[PDB]
Paper text:
Linker histones are major nucleosome-binding proteins, which mediate chromatin compaction, and approximately 50–130% amounts of linker histones relative to nucleosomes are present in cells. We determined the cryo-EM structures of the nucleosome and the H1–nucleosome complex with 24-bp linker DNAs and compared them to the structures of the DEK–nucleosome complexes. Linker histone H1 is a major nucleosome-binding protein that also adopts tripartite DNA binding in the nucleosome but does not interact with the acidic patch. We found that the linker DNAs are sharply bent in the DEK2–nucleosome complex and their orientations shift toward opposite sides compared to those in the free and H1–nucleosome complexes (side views). In contrast, the linker DNA orientation of the DEK1–nucleosome complex is intermediate between those of the H1–nucleosome and DEK2–nucleosome complexes. For comparison, we visualized the polynucleosome in the presence of linker histone H1. The average size of the H1-containing polynucleosomes was 312 pixels. Therefore, the compaction of the polynucleosome by DEK may not be as drastic as that by linker histone H1.
Numbering used by the authors:
A (entry chain B): 18 to 102
B (entry chain H), F (entry chain D): 30 to 124
C (entry chain K): 38 to 108
D (entry chain A), I (entry chain E): 38 to 135
E (entry chain G), G (entry chain C): 10 to 118
H (entry chain F): 21 to 102
Write the structure that this text describes.
DNA sequence: GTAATATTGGCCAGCTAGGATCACAATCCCGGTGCCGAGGCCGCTCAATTGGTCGTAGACAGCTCTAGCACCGCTTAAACGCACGTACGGATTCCGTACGTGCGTTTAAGCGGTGCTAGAGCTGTCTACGACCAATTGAGCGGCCTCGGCACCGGGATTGTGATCCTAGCTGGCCAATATTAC
DNA sequence: GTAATATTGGCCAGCTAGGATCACAATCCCGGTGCCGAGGCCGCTCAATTGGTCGTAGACAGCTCTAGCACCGCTTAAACGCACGTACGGAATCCGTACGTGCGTTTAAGCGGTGCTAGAGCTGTCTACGACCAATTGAGCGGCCTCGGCACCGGGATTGTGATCCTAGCTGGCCAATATTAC
């Protein structure tokens, strides 16, 4: 029922980072960017998911709804429109 | 059963048909406009409420709205928004 | 070994249409086992004087910069 | 024999991925990763699909803006390549701890 | 004995709902009391912002030969307008993408 | 006549004498501490109120405070603040 | 017929005012109603933050041989603590100055 | 009326600010750029302060108006009674 | 004849102005400047002294933080000197229009 | 004074550039298709409206006196302008290799599908809890006094920096020894 | 082959790097001192407290059913790994000059002291306005239906890139025209 989903950060693969970066306009990328970005991403996610699970727990719910995520981002001053804000 | 959610969609569609009679709006975009309007509303209303207490004023009035609008919107946007809003309140007061 | 005798042997190591680079002289003299680390300025004066003699020639750059040839 | 010189196809794919809007992170790895992160704070947590999609849309916007600032830092160095030092600087200046 | 119904928004010559905004200022617990001209002025302000946005977005879509505006068009309208990009600068738009923006040095010579 | 300025100064002085009996406080720093307490207050109270409405709850209670504290303070600070606060509310409930 | 006065803060074993904070949550019109444990918990939280700050600031002042804390000491306490500098990171302190921070490359060799 | 006192933020004052910021060597163009930056900042802060003032039907800008202007800008300033 | 080599007294004054807290902008020029800015928005405006002092206090903190970020940008370039390009970059990355 | 050799300017030839040409991939475009989301219609409901009452927030007027402004004069630290020089930025060159690009290979995402059910979401009950109130009262505010912390001053001490000299080492040159040349 | 000379090696002189030392000035440390702000005391006030009432918000149980989760099996598309190679970053060098440093001169900031007014802040009156309630009603919601915009595609058309060929401009060597040296 509850899988142990460890070691997954490497699932954000090198080409996925390539295409996001490319969407950001960068042309040439050093091979060390990948680990740095994975670390950045784990940090960002940690903060967002902490805030979201908190907003969830308060409701006594055991499911994190999208309203919880948009409130968490909005709380971090990164408001996101289109998901029921 | 009857379940009611809140949106501005029809009002947005009205505005759109006033400005672009020959143009459509995807329900994805109407969910962003709805979120758009609610976020701008939350900023303006929060600033107006916040400003009234910071002025020891217990009421939100046209003044409180006017300075929150003037305060949030930058430059040429504020000048026109303020202008049409004053025009509208005058018309409403006259009515 | 005193400098200005290994630089000749180093520049003698190649024919290049725009001369041997300074990086080559550094690598060659290191391969001769010389303390190119500490004697760098001595090396620059030995080279510049020896091209100034015309025994060598500087053919691109200026000074120790660029590239060099035999007479 | 044909081989595009380095940097050309990169510019084409730049034009492409900027013209486009598709989510760029693969969906299942990102969902499993999200579950990884949430699992640390509490176990047996359930996610609506819209919520995971929101995390993904937000992550993509955050990293894209970070790469914008990073590319600006790299260009300022007069270096076309980005390196991690650029990321730590872009983040430190954004004010986030780095 | 009862006058013909005349919506406050029609009394103001607007499309945005005055009653709904009135409700939301009172039921938002912003203030215990709310003046009468505040909801009118506020609805007009929201009207102006939505009309500005929709004008720009429709321009972007017609420019892109799309007869219907979609989120990318909103992202274009926003980011191509200076004062809006200032107002919504800290904002991330769903499915918006990014402006086409290649820094000059990156182009080959 | 009668003019009233609000501060936390004496409470700050009490706390200070509890932690550093042999230390003083500049009036400048007590105006900073007063502003600091009011700022932290405003953040926490705003988040708790904002949360309750976002949860369709009309009341601020220990739960709303607990989640706002847990939200705003990062890590080891939150864990200890939460801990002492729970201890204090328990004592108050017992009393 | 009237019990001996016992302040809520003494009923909680605190120095911060429970009545004043209670007043502020009700008067600031945050919510129409306020539970009973909320002001207690909040006063305790404000207590913990002020005690943490004052501990660190007093340490800084004694470190600087100063028997009395002044704003520079607060700026030192804040910026030298990681989690506080995180909480008050976007904050500018009056007369605080800056941490002594010379980047290594700038020192001569 | 006052005019051209933006030069009042003199070269050594900019030098000392930079130094408090950890700056060691400075190019001579920094001065005009920083005067412009500073001009931008002030016109935003003062716009917000005069606005808060006008709203109170008041004709003097108090320190509390300045505090709230910065606090709106997300640069809250302690020490001034805020 | 005595002359400190360039950069030494600069580091001394760095240590100094970081140990210190005095306001760095001269008070009267800054007050007159503030009046110049306010005059554009409305005429005949009166300033409490505490209010002008607040503007000065805030400007010094803002420029100091800006110079922190700018010096980081300059050092990233591997250039000890700061130049205006550093300022436009630091500001553009802070997110303020520049 | 005159001529042969050498010197200098021009031409022909050779080398390198720039322009033109070609061939392929990527982009786009024009047009056809269906498909599904946008847009319209329907009888429902609660929210908007209307009208009348109460009371109270706030507009308004008047008074006080704080404090903001203006102005003068002096002293002096800070600003300014200039001279001077070092260290820096920046241009140049070169090199190694990390990236990029293009193959084949492998993986797992994605899709569609089925099955299961926890848990979201709503409803009803009811009571604990919080608002409100009057009477009570003591903590907290302002005013006043004071005395110890500390900023300043001056002398002595320490540290950091730049400038200088000394010594060992090495390189370059002369005389003597060896290798080469001559006897 | 042997000896003398000319080339090279050994000794001596000159130059540099590292180490040591001195000069000197910025900082620190220490006493003393006098100022004045922190801190305590007193008295007065109103906000906190107590106890009681009353209404209802929300805790709680119970039910529906949506939506989340899990597994399965094909189908590609994407990820992966590797070969090859070139554009890039980065080290090294050098040069010019822009800025730091320091000095002497000028300016105006700062103080402080005086005088004046406008505006900050408060109080009291009174009233327009908004909350509230009850009755009314129609705009908006969800559900159904429907059809045109658009995604996709298949097949041409247009463009961009990378590579090659030719004409051309520039530079070099030899010859032609001209100065320099020898007879």
């Amino acid at each position: 029922h509850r899988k142990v989903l460890r070691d997954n950060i490497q699932g954000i693969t090198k080409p996925a980072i390539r295409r996001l970066a490319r969407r950001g306009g960068v042309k040439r990328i050093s091979g060390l960017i990948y680990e740095e970005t994975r670390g950045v991403l784990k940090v960002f996610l940690e903060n967002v998911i902490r805030d979201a699970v908190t907003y969830t727990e308060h409701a006594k719910r055991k499911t994190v709804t999208a309203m919880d995520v948009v409130y968490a981002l909005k709380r971090q001053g990164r408001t996101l429109y289109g998901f029921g804000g | 059963k009857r379940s009611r959610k809140e949106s501005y969609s029809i009002y947005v569609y009205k505005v759109l048909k006033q400005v672009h009679p020959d143009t459509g709006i995807s329900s994805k975009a109407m969910g962003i406009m709805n979120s758009f309007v609610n976020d701008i509303f939350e900023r303006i209303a929060g600033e107006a409420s916040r400003l009234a207490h910071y002025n020891k004023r217990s009421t939100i009035t046209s003044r409180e709205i006017q300075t929150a609008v003037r305060l949030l919107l930058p430059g040429e946007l504020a000048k026109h928004a303020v202008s049409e809003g004053t025009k509208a309140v005058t018309k409403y007061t006259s009515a | 070994p005193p400098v200005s005798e290994l630089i000749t042997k180093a520049v003698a190591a190649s024919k290049e249409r725009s001369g041997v680079s300074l990086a080559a002289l550094k690598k060659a003299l290191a391969a001769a086992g010389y303390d190119v680390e500490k004697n760098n300025s001595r090396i620059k004066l030995g080279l510049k004087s020896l091209v100034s003699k015309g025994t060598l020639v500087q053919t691109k750059g200026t000074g120790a910069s660029g590239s060099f040839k035999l007479n | 024999p044909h081989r595009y010189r380095p940097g050309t196809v990169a510019l084409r794919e730049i034009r492409r991925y900027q013209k486009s809007t598709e989510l760029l992170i693969r969906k299942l790895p990102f969902q499993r990763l999200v579950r990884e992160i949430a699992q640390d704070f509490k176990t047996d947590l359930r996610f609506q699909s819209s919520a995971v999609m929101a995390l993904q849309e937000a992550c993509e916007a955050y990293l894209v803006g970070l790469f914008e600032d990073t590319n600006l830092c790299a260009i300022h160095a007069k270096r076309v390549t980005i390196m991690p030092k650029d990321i730590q600087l872009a983040r430190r200046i954004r004010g986030e701890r780095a | 004995a009862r006058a013909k119904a005349k919506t406050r928004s029609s009394r103001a010559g607007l499309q945005f709902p005055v009653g709904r905004v009135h409700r939301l200022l009172r039921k938002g617990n912003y203030s215990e009391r709310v003046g009468a001209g505040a909801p009118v002025y506020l609805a007009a302000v929201l009207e102006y912002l939505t009309a500005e946005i929709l004008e720009l977005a429709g321009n972007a879509a017609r420019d892109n030969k799309k007869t219907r505006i979609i989120p990318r068009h909103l992202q274009l309208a926003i980011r191509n307008d200076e004062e809006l990009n200032k107002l919504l600068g800290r904002v991330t738009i769903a499915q918006g993408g990014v402006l086409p923006n290649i820094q000059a040095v990156l182009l080959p010579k």
